[model samples]
Target chain A: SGFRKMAFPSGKVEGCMVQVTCGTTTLNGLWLDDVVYCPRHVICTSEDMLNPNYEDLLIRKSNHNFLVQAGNVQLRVIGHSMQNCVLKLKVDTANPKTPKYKFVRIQPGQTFSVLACYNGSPSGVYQCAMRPNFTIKGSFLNGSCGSVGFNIDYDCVSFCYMHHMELPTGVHAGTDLEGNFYGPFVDRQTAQAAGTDTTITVNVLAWLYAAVINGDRWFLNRFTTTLNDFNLVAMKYNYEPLTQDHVDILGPLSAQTGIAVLDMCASLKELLQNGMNGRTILGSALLEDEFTPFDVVRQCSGVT
Target chain B: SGFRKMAFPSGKVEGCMVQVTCGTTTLNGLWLDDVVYCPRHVICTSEDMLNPNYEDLLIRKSNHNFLVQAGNVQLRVIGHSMQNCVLKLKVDTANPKTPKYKFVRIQPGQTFSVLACYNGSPSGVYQCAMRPNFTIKGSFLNGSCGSVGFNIDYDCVSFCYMHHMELPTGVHAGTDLEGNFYGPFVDRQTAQAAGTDTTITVNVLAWLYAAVINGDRWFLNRFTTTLNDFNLVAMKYNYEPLTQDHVDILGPLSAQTGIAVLDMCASLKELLQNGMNGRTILGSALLEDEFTPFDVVRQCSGVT
Candidate 1:
């Protein structure tokens, strides 16, 4: 079974030539919800949706792809272009055998020649990478190059999950939920030595999410505490209308970070929404770290 | 100026038919950041952006329509299909005179026939109302019906602002920030009698936002307070374990609201992010209400 993102984002189509590719190395095996993806495109079957045959009845399709009843396995259509992240999809209505929904993809600069139908005739323009909670955004474009077609970008995110299970009795840090017992790592190398396996560099969404939730916790807590400190500093020091000298007690985090301070707070607010009920653990592996939760909290919260 | 949301939503595209229309009456002579609207379509001129002629160099364009440096009056591309809120956008590269950007719109059962360019040629599918702090989402579709192209819906919202100024001596509600003295109104009609001039009917976003922020305040405050109360109940009542009887004291709010409870809390967190620095009032007129800010707090908070 497959789903189509109707509009290939304008940015991708700006080049007037959007393309798709499967990395030289394609891993096999695995499933997301129930939607399994390959390097090139995605396919959904009738068995997937609640009312598969009647696609019309399926309401409320948004950023997260299609949804309805239970056991709903999401077959996402994603893309690869840098600026353009959206790609469009169309079902294989032409083929009555299997219900196959597909997106516009390609071999290379080696462009294919589809009819170029505007909604009137024939046409169009137009990712990989995989993630548990991935969004496949698509769009259509009318470019200046006289090339009005569609393009696709692969938004394959693989930020393995992190879990806060087995919180070490007295440490502020966390350890890999799988592989080893939970304990605060001694240092960066200690974490690396633990063979930590999840949420790597380009795939730190899960980690950042965990950090944001913790950051919000600390940030809000700090707001009240800092306010109290301000009151104390004002009264005890007898400083009429306190100045920066008095404010410094709130620590290095001050206007130096500028708008980014709120930027961090706000950005974290968004990231934490995709959290695992604030528990920071699920089916995926874990990330062992020496940095306390507060460390990530500071980093993501923009204070650090 | 105007913007377009490319990709009329899949749900909107589902009816296989999309449309647009003006209300029975229309209002005019106003500006939003710069862009203005009639009851149908939106328009953007060369004067809106800095490098208006060159639409490409403008990077980082997403949810918000267009952007650039200094005095950048945004010409947003937006739409109004409920399940299909997205509409496709195209530039008047066909005209090249004033560099106008537009989305599709129309009148009556008003089925338009624009050759339906499938990128191979010419074609289409398809708004009103206006507001500041608005988003114009659009999209495209290859629906089941024989027809192909675009359709648009206007997302004209109007939520008037609320101000925390005039911090009344001892009351908790808010008054019209612009019309009269900022003090808590006596009652509902009292606020109505005072004549609220903003954010009515379909325009309560700004108020909901203010309420959400305050709700977050009180909700988070309640979380801590309720936790403390739980501790007190356990210690004072000497109950081996807590039950519904003990929990009910926290008030009528319980899981009876089910997921909607977190739905409210989480939705509030999201709504508050779009706030004006937690201080509601801005350039728009104000929404005066006698309900204590806490009333909105609880309503938006999902408890009452």
Candidate 2:
């Protein structure tokens, strides 16, 4: 029943400050709807960067900023190219359990602004945590090291090597010669340490999304085989039939991974169909709170 | 395309007997489809029994014998009315790479029958298998364990019993328990033993079916709250949105766990949504498989 919205002010020039009002019906309640922008209709071509044609890009770059004027709202910048990077202006809804997500990307050095409309959907003091891929240079074991916030401590414990014999029991035979390995599949710790930055991130998101989709059966399984194959998970969840609330959680996560959210949904469906607990393993705040360990293996088959 | 069609004469029933053939082209391949009935739909019902239903029931004598059939294909005579037991039928779908499954029920002298069309759009080989549920006599351990195929073995090739603990080089303090046993999820032996049964029997099908669903993210998330809640070994391959071939292989295995094919479709969506195999313990398979042992405190909650 609670509703809120966000958008970049029209015709705002670079460096020009815009306004965002937190929709607060009650003085105690405030919320903001976030916006997102993809290279909407624009195709990034080699020659285009010289002339700088904005129309070719999907979203308008100049309209990617906003001012939080009331209630409860905050903004943080994430990603590369402050001006051209995908701009994200988020606002928590009056209802704390769920928040709205929006996207925007604009050309920079100019002041990009948002008009926050927070209609007190929730009644409390709420704050937003901004998470954009940030590079950090800090001191560790002996010298300082550069690391990303997203890649911290997201590995499972490893005891020994798990030798896989074959199918049915492609199980972990035990540790290698050093006696330092374990698992039927790569254990969580190994999965985290096993891939490059891009792989790890995508793997985790894939698992998480699958857990969510697999949770609902009536939602998946309605599409044709081809659609089922590419967006197999979506086909299973019947995404076309869900309320916005159900799809919202997955939509962003899917974008983050660059894979179909429906695949994760299908994987989740598989997990649920099997009646197992991989989702718990992924969602538990204890297990680094990002993605489920099984998510890595189930989705590890190959990007394609 | 390869096509062959044949029919059996009603009066005479035996192997390699054909009474009808309706096809546009000449038959070159073996006309016998091989499969008599799907293990799930095979029937051994009382209708196959003789002397009329009422007359046989009214007489209710030990000397009475009734004819029985499975999938209305094979016929056999059963003595007396033993309707207070269970029957399990397994199948062997000639795929060494994947496991098989079965259909199970708790009713004695019950028939497992089917009338499946084979070969074309409206054709499928009717196939089924039957086995009595209870093992009254102890002499038939060769195969009559009445075991629904899957029995997990915890390979403890490496044992960890707490012997003693010395202080570490660091100043950190920690308690040292002297008597604790540790074992990897499964060794080659365990994996092999777990897959002892090769038949696509009903029990096997049900076991695989249950295992897949249990391993599924969608189903498991809603039902499986923790690692202990689901079997680790079985879940390893429960990812959904499989093709027909994938299902053919997975379906039989899952059915051993008592899951329907449609259930696989449902579970696949769940797995995708929940991310069934996102992370691993340094890439171990513990969390991926549904039958992974959960005896240790570490496996139950220590993974995080």
Candidate 3:
């Protein structure tokens, strides 16, 4: 067994460092549940759902020296956001091995790193992935309330949104506040006929999606409480307020586009429906429109 | 310089255990704050405070084992409640002398043991110290009040009593809500003069005290906010609340004791006071016959 020196928030622990004691032993899994794997030089969201994109370039350590290189996309977290994320890197020192990657906690401005000990020297190419908990509430699109309307639940939503929030076409807003403007989801023709705008809306969302990585009750509660306070409620029960902020935003061309974007958020939330418990950000059409001006709901903003 | 490992709340980081490629010479200081010079096995508060204190413990390392034994008492915390408390342990692995101690960071509930270098070589001891910053909120006493008077300004009384709230006292309750029972402060002669039954009301001292080691504004704000909340005032400015918890505790007590405890606490806030601010226990009074039981105000409690 050897000593492992881990840099927090980075998730890539290398055995090549001098202080590391462990060698050639397969130190197995220690991961933050459902965290996305972030790579070096990834562009993070400014509170967007699809975060950690390669904004500028990727900088890595090779042969005891830091190498900075250019990359395409980058991810930036806008406001305070929480999502399970991971990173995997190849280490080339001491006992060479590939340590698993997992996130423990990632606050608004916090970064963490971890190290897993394995036998042999660390080397070879490593890959990273991300899986998020996309749970939300779902209601029938036809107003007739029942559990079956969307047939999708929280798990489905988690998977679908994991895909949706990641997609490059996902709507980006200026802020996380209610009623923020967003760009078109599909095109102008479909939004007008469905009475839904191309932009995101509070009413269109079946449920509000909140990101939680591990079973950190304290962190989760803080996130949920703040979101609830935004909507001016205590129950942790997700509900859209009946106010101007609840209204969805209009797009560059059509006012109805906002409705469509909101519908996308709602549809995603519905796909990931969970228990009817706890305070949550609501899917109020009024609130969504009110906040479209912020980066969170705009075309430039990524999914939060 | 040799490698030195410090203890932290999470774990210990050995000096030799840390390896850096570049010029990054500093290690994490999380656990270093917990290590004391001399350590003995005792559980009582008084014992921990006095005999066999931490300063006496000395560490001598050889091979894979590290030995801790009782020695001198030269160690002292330079700032607020061990905020900058550093470790100075004597290390002796080879030819022995009055070995020099090193500073190390040790956190609570974290223990790091010695690791053998080259499989069998004896480990050497080094000097290191911790700069700790974990914070805790002060707990309310005796109805969260009834503590003894400080020796400074009447401000102690103002904070603990007038500004703060109190719970109802015993059978002889004069005010609906009284102040915390701080102390009687009667001289030996005065205590005897009160008569076999003569009544005298000795109110408990109530006030807020915060300890700041340096220029940590976040710590200052959180601690101040927590104490100020008891007064139920939004701002600590000119706003004041009148009630039993205040005057009875602050006014009368300040009149008796030359110095108000609150002033001492405030002095500390301003970087004027010295040492860790000790917690004041309950108050007492001398009683006589036929006087208001209110006149014979006294509340007693243990400090441990």
Candidate 4:
């Protein structure tokens, strides 16, 4: 459900020439112009790079000279490696540590385009770079053989954060502090600001997974805190509170983890049957979306 | 570990004479002196009352007049029933429409003491009435045959309104209009004045049970609201914020309900898979104890 009519050709096709088309847009690539190297396996040069040992050997030494059409953020990759290569697409910046945006595997003469993936800033400048590497069997090279940086300046807006919260007094109708009506779990600003949300979500998932395996109830509290915080945020934001449906979705997830807790509790109780004073049971116990602020406004207001 | 050391002698024992004792306190019963009736079963009259037909058949005509020890708020059923009877101890007032508290089955010559159960108020008047009824293997009378309104002037404090709240921040931690630190929740005065706390607790339990059965996530919101309100109450009282342990306990309980909602959503999605839009999956989702205000303060302070 992304950019259409873009295909990467097999290495058997010919020299490193690739073409990409979307609707009325067609772009022809410069064949064998960026770099050159030897094929690894099979009749197709692209098939050789797919080997785990392909990355161990240097495939090419040339700057990836490529064409660029910047607008509404988009990216395209044309693999010119001697062997089939793996490409890493880093959006916004070249630093790969933060998070890799995307990865693509291309044949020697193949081309892939990612369209409308990111939008430019108010100045209409978005930076993204592609680095190519070869993979042989399971082993691969550490660095990109060729790299290209391009700019995309488009007018399209993305749906960054599509979740919101609402207070319940309005009967699922209260607005957040920003006066935005309730939608999902986190608002765009909130999500962007509340970095802890992800950490908390991740930590909880980890805890749940671990607790399930370890049969520990201590993890139950984490679940409760997560759910509770979700509620509290709604309160602080003056967003509408959660509904039964929300809890229902919430309950089972917690329970999947909860049953484990209960199991642990039961086991603990059995151990302490003679030592403990009484029967004790351990207990306890995000949304999304897309598009632009205007699209969001329309989405929220039922103007689809 | 509830009530200790008291047994109801079967009807084989002559006369309805029951005696009860608790820590230096002993009372002899003119049990049959209060109410008198004949045995029904071949060997033991008490056996008759246990029968299914007991409630349907009329068994007695006379009212039971009895003496009670009002200190420390313990109830002893000095059943003077003409027949070995069955008595149900319904705590609090009964409209017969709502839920019942406790039910007790009594035999002739048996003095079962419900001890340390109900404490007295300042005026020594803890309002409770002993309603006696007669039972015959499947037949019996169904009214409060006799009533005794006793006063308990003892100075024992109770544990009530044990649940509290905690705010995420000090924001809005100030007092309500009542000058109580608890805002948007129970203040000290409200807790003391509103005897409806017990009722609220019962209603919540009922709601939780019903919601769980109905697979309703809407109830989860109610739970969050309750927990949130409890947190707010904690804020007002300057009580400690919830630790991870609390959340642990809370999370599982919530997840217990939440997971049910997810299952329901899944079922609904499956049912509507053919009829609904592709994006539909993204769309639908989602007590305490007997104690008192004084005990509450001490417990909140970690002194108990």
* Reproduced native contacts, each prediction: 0.00, 0.00, 0.00, 0.00
How well does chain B match by TM-score in each candidate?
0.16, 0.17, 0.15, 0.20
User: lDDT score, residue B67, model 1?
Assistant: 17
User: For model 2, what fraction of the real interface contacts is kept?
Assistant: 0.00
Position A271, candidate 2: lDDT: 42
Compared with the true structure, what per-residue lDDT tens digits does model 4 show for residues A1-304?
Answer: 0000111111111112223222222332211222221112111133332333434433332123322223322334344333222222112222111111212222211112211111110100011111111111010011111111111112111111100111121111111112222223221112221111111121123223333432333323322223444545544433334344433433433454444323332332232223222222211111111111221122122220
| TM-scores of the candidates, chain A only | 0.16, 0.19, 0.16, 0.20
Task: Tell me the chain A TM-score of model 2.
Answer: 0.19
Query: Could you estimate the TM-score for every candidate?
Result: 0.20, 0.18, 0.21, 0.15
Candidate 1 CA-lDDT value: 0.22
Interface Cα RMSD, each model: 21.8, 33.3, 26.8, 37.8
Off by over 4 Å in 1: A1-197, A200-304, B1-304
Candidate 1 lDDT for residue A247 = 37
Per-residue lDDT of candidate 4, residues B107-202 (tens digit): 211111111111110100011111111101010011101111111112111111011111221111111111222223321112222111111121
Candidate 3 lDDT over B1-304, as tens digits, reads: 0000111111111211211011111111111232322111111133332333333321222212222221211222221111112222223322122112232323211112221111111121111110011110111111111111001011111111110111121101000012211122111111111112111111112211111111111212222222344334312322222334443444443444333434422432332122223221111011011111121121001000
Runs with alpha carbons beyond 4 Å of true place in candidate 2: A1-199, A216-304, B1-149, B152-304
